[PDB]
Amino acid sequence: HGFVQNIVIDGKNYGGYLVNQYPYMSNPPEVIAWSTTATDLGFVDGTGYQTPDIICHRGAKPGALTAPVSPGGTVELQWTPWPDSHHGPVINYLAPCNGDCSTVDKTQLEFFKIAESGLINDDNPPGIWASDNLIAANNSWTVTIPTTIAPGNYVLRHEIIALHSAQNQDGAQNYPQCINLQVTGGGSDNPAGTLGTALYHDTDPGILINIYQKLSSYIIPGPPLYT
Ligand SMILES: *[C@@H]1O[C@H](CO)[C@@H](O)[C@H](O)[C@H]1NC(C)=O
Numbered sequence: 001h002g003f004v005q006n007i008v009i010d011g012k013n014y015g016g017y018l019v020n021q022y023p024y025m026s027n028p029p030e031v032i033a034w035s036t037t038a039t040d041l042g043f044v045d046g047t048g049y050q051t052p053d054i055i056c057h058r059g060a061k062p063g064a065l066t067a068p069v070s071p072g073g074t075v076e077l078q079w080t081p082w083p084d085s086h087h088g089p090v091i092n093y094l095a096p097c098n099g100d101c102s103t104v105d106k107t108q109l110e111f112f113k114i115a116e117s118g119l120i121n122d123d124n125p126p127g128i129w130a131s132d133n134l135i136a137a138n139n140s141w142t143v144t145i146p147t148t149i150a151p152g153n154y155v156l157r158h159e160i161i162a163l164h165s166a167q168n169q170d171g172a173q174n175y176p177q178c179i180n181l182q183v184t185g186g187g188s189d190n191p192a193g194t195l196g197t198a199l200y201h202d203t204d205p206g207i208l209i210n211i212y213q214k215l216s217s218y219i220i221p222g223p224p225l226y227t
């Protein structure tokens with residue numbers, strides 16, 4: 001359980017969607033982060049993979065604001081303290097807004113994977129995962145925006161998948177957090193995109209899995225990494 005509290009881009013903080021404050025306020029502030037109704041600081045499980053909730057979390061609506069990123073620049077997402085128990089991958093996707101991200105129809109967004117990290121070491125099951133790298137970095141993740149993509153406005157869909165309960169059907173816990181970016185530079189790729197509701201299926205090999213046994217491999221879920 002947790003959420004993205006802050007985003008650091010080009011030397012400033014863009015406050016996140018503080019899901020334990022703003023839903024209680026009813027004139028809440030404009031941010032680059034999508035609003036959600038996930039006030040339990042919880043997840044979307046396999047029962048919601050083909051519902052709109054998987055796209056940018058439960059009841060999500062676009063952020064009003066968009067943050068510019070320098071070409072090949074970094075976006076640092078700062079989480080609330082991630083529990084060690086919640087082992088799993090950290091995955092990052094972009095989807096083009098083709099206009100102002102604040103007015104997009106999330107159900108039409110087509111995402112391409114720009115980064116993925118999974119099982120890092122398995123010397124002591126359940127092992128060390130991307131989520132453990134995030135904890136070791138004091139609960140932050142650095143995303144590098146590719147220089148090869150067409151610039152414009154994009155949703156960044158940043159996600160941890162916790163696998164501590166994933167040996168049961170619908171046990172994997174997805175924690176997507178979306179932010180609005182203005183990608184800048186000289187690139188031209190328009191990578192093939194995947195609807196939010198086709199990223200994951202509740203029987204995928206990196207989703208329905210017992211992490212407590214020795215693992216020979218881990219197949220990071222979602223569509224193929226763009227390079
Ligand atoms: C996180 O930062 C705090 C100090 O702000 C430190 O006490 C803690 O050990 C840090 N680093 C790691 C690797 O967790």
Ligand SMILES: [Cu+2]
Nearest residue numbers: 001002042086
């Ligand atoms: Cu949790």
